[PDB]
Amino acid sequence: SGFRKMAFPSGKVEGCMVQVTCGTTTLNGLWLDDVVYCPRHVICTSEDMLNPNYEDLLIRKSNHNFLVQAGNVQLRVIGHSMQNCVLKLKVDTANPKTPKYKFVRIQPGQTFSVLACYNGSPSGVYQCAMRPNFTIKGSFLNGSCGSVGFNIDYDCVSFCYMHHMELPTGVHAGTDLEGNFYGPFVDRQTAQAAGTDTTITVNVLAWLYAAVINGDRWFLNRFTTTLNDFNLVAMKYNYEPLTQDHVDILGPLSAQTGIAVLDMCASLKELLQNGMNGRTILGSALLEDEFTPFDVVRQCSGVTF
Amino acid sequence: SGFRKMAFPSGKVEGCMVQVTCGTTTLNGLWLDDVVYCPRHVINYEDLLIRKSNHNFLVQAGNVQLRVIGHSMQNCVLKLKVDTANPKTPKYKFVRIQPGQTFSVLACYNGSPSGVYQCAMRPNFTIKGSFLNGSCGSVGFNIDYDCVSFCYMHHMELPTGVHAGTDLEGNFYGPFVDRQTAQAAGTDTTITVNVLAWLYAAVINGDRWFLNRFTTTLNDFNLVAMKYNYEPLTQDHVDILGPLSAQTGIAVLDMCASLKELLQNGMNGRTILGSALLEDEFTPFDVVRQCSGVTF
Ligand SMILES: CC(=O)Nc1ccc2cncc(NC(=O)Cc3cccc(Cl)c3)c2c1
Ligand SMILES: [Cl-]
């Protein structure tokens, strides 16, 4: 019993964290085999960030301008290249702690664990989701750049995020491990603002099924809804549209509890209308959207209470 | 910016997790040097233990079978002497925590870590964890510098869904016993010093709507807090909040007057750090650490 925001064990990622220094800037790098991946803005000054020409800044650099530190050992850089917004530093030593891994690009609504690092040293781990506006509501201070997001399914680490910047509202933006940003963001200091955010409807529904699995049904009602009527109501509360794919994905949880997706949609509609009336669901007074249908199946029991 | 329930990096503990089987029961063990620590309920415990030999205990570390060469009991923990020292043993200490203190939990099943989360020892000595059958032997810890301080080992789930366990010396937290009997968690209370720390974290992150011009006395605050099932606030708690009071310019009894107003009026449709409830699972030290950048 119980329901917590659980992160994946971070050990496999901790053994890949390194410190990258270029001139006066120091940030984090990910060391996999003989390559260190880090944000390309490590080659920039603060002045450069207004309109940086990365190709022009990089051509003026040699291998020995990049200092890479793994624990107490200095790694020697023997090559460098840029791939989108990521700098790839070829080093002379392969990481003996390299786990089985893949680089995966996630979609909004997907969750992942973040290992927050400073000076190549891991300080904490937390779970979060890629928001519909492509930002992440993280907890990052200056020096956290290069910190990574990941999932561990079985013994394989799937890297999905690398931290690049904080936006004026305090939310965070970054790239996949191939250097492609999530969202319409650039690694430039410009008027960049996160778009209006919305609630991840399929995740709220999954969390309502998790509450039913853990023995709580006070929020159910005797109504059903069409998918269109649900979406017309949900969009008024800034909820993401629920698609037929989302209904298909909730199928297993619907069969485990005996509550049709559209009947759970009717209960969500009523919750938006009435609020909680002093009650909580899984210890929360807000509707939670950072648990996917997959996370609920992973964490919760296969037997409903 | 941002404020998350953050756990310590779990790598140092992951390298200590093993699977312990005794007959039909399978649970988790902690392998430090040549000793495996696990709940004694894996097996009248003295009478059950005397009938066991070393070969009755099967210990599995990854894909390798460890050979048990001795066994002894210390309170509610079984200590299995194995023939191999753990080469991944970190620098460690066994410490007993107090209610209100927080720690990270590495939840395991069959000796394999599945997740990590942060939680607090409640005033009623239970933990609001997330554990399924097979999680027994999962451990709680903090990391200070490069040293892992083990503070909790999971033993059982209570009828309300909350969890109970021991320190690593086998002493239960709370009035619980390791057996099937009518055991219920006492009425819980809110960890006041932690709620205050989280209010200071909200001010640091730019949330001041709850701040007011008023200040209170410690006695008046405690008379009000006792009415809402909040733990009494002591002079030690006021002293401990000193650094956060100096950083934001809000005296502790100044923040107590804000908390008193939130207790009598609620939030009025507003949130603090994305929450509609007053959060009590962040200590003053956790707030200072997450708003500073301490690494391990
Ligand atoms: C003093 C300061 O920079 N504070 C914070 C606070 C919090 C921060 C959290 N994450 C990242 C930071 N770093 C950046 O945003 C550097 C950067 C600037 C301009 C564009 C880009 Cl692509 C990257 C943070 C920086
Ligand atoms: Cl995805």
Task: Quickly list DSSP for B99-155.
Answer: TT-EEEEEEEETTEEEEEEEEE--TTS-B-----TT-TT-EEEEEETTEEEEEEEEE
* Helix, strand, coil percent values for chain B (each to nearest 5): 25, 30, 45
Distance CA B243, CA B233 (A): 17
| Inter-chain touch B4–A126, beta carbons under 8 Å | yes
Which phi and psi angles does B66 have, rounded to 5°? -90, 140
Which residues of chain B lie closer than 8 angstroms to A125, CB-CB? 6-10, 116
Torsion angle defined by CA atoms of residues B101, A151, A293 and A175, in that order, rounded to the nearest 10 degrees: 110
Distance CA B291, CA A221 (A): 43
Closest CA to B12 of B105, B89, B115: B89
Q: How many CB atoms lie within 10 A of CB A7?
A: 30
Q: How was this entry determined?
A: X-ray
A258 touches chain B (CB under 8 A): no
Residues 6+ apart with CB under 8 A from A65: A22, A23
Q: How is residue A188 annotated by DSSP?
A: S
Strand boundaries in A121-255, DSSP class E: 121-129, 148-153, 156-166, 172-175
Helix (H) or strand (E) holding A203: helix A201-213
The verdict on the CB of residue A166 being under 6 Å from ligand 1 is: yes
The b/e string for A239-249 (b: 16+ C-beta within 10 A; e otherwise) is bbebeeebbeb
A7 touches chain B (CB under 8 A): yes
Residue in the structure block whose two tokens are 């200070």: B144
* Helix, strand, coil percent values for chain A (each to nearest 5): 25, 30, 45
Closest CA to A211 of A301, A111, A126, A273: A301
B4 touches chain A (CB under 8 A): yes
Closest CA to A305 of B209, B161, B207: B161
Distance CA B210, CA B196 (A): 12
Distance CA A161, CA B265 (A): 41
| Inter-chain touch A170–B4, beta carbons under 8 Å | no
Q: Which two tokens stand for residue B178?
A: 């390791």
| Inter-chain touch A170–B205, beta carbons under 8 Å | yes
Residue in chain A nearest B291 by alpha carbon:
A141
Residue in chain B nearest A11 by alpha carbon:
B11
Q: How is residue A195 annotated by DSSP?
A: P
What is the side-by-side order of every strand in the sheet holding A73-75? A73-75, A66-70, A17-22, A25-32, A35-39, A86-91, A77-83
Residue in chain A nearest B266 by alpha carbon:
A278
Distance CA A50, CA A18 (A): 27
Distance CA A191, CA A280 (A): 39
Residue in chain A nearest B158 by alpha carbon:
A1
Which residues of chain A lie closer than 8 angstroms to B162, CB-CB? 2
Distance A15 CA to ligand 1 centre (A): 24
A124 touches chain B (CB under 8 A): yes
Q: Are B252 and B245 in contact (CB under 8 A)?
A: yes
Distance CA B119, CA B281 (A): 6
Q: Residue A183: exposed, middle, or buried by beta-carbon count in 10 A (0-12, 13-18, 19+)? A: buried
Distance CA A13, CA A157 (A): 8
| Inter-chain touch B117–A4, beta carbons under 8 Å | yes
Q: Are A222 and A156 in contact (CB under 8 A)?
A: no
Q: Residue B24: exposed, middle, or buried by beta-carbon count in 10 A (0-12, 13-18, 19+)? A: exposed
The number of the ligand nearest the C-alpha atom of A112 reads: 2
Residues of A with a known catalytic role: 41, 145
Which residues of chain A lie closer than 8 angstroms to B113, CB-CB? 9, 11
Closest CA to A132 of A232, A231, A240: A240
Resolution of the coordinates, Å: 1.7
> Which sign does the torsion angle of CA B216, B222, B228, B231 carry?
positive
The closest CB to that of A139, out of B4, B9, B12, belongs to: B4
Amino acid, res. B14:
E
Biggest alpha carbon–alpha carbon distance for chain A: 69
The verdict on the CB of residue A117 being under 6 Å from ligand 1 is: no
Cα angle vertex B272, ends B271, B273, to 5°? 115
CB-proximal residues (5 Å) to ion ligand 2: A 106-107, 110
Distance A105 CA to ligand 2 centre (A): 7
Biggest alpha carbon–alpha carbon distance for chain B: 69
> Which sign does the torsion angle of CA A101, A106, A110, A116 carry?
positive
In DSSP terms, B66 is beta-bridged to B59
Residue in the structure block whose two tokens are 């300080």: A123
Which residues of chain B lie closer than 8 angstroms to A2, CB-CB? 128-131, 161-163
The verdict on the CB of residue A186 being under 6 Å from ligand 1 is: no
B90 touches chain A (CB under 8 A): no
Residue in the structure block whose two tokens are 């990521």: A86
A55-60 contact pairs (CB < 8 A, 24+): A55/A82, A58/A82, A58/A87
Q: Helix (H, G, I), strand (E, B), or coil: what is residue B20?
A: strand
Q: How many CB atoms lie within 10 A of CB A222?
A: 7
For chain A, list the domains and their CATH numbers. 1-14+100-197 (2.40.10.10), 15-99 (2.40.10.10), 198-301 (1.10.1840.10)
Closest CA to A48 of A61, A35, A67: A61
Which residues of chain A lie closer than 8 angstroms to B14, CB-CB? 9, 11
Q: Are B238 and B215 in contact (CB under 8 A)?
A: no
Residues 6+ apart with CB under 8 A from B196: B233, B237, B241, B252, B255, B256, B259, B284
Residues of B with a known catalytic role: 41, 136
Which phi and psi angles does A274 have, rounded to 5°? -100, -20
The closest CB to that of B130, out of A4, A117, A285, belongs to: A4
Distance CA A67, CA A65 (A): 7
Tell me which residue has its CA closest to atom 3 in ligand 1. Answer: A142
Helix (H) or strand (E) holding B264: helix B252-265
Distance between the two ends of chain B, CA-based, in angstroms? Answer: 20
- Kindly list the distances between the CA atom of residue B284 and the CA atoms of A87, A276, B257, in Å, as whole numbers in the listed order: 38, 30, 18
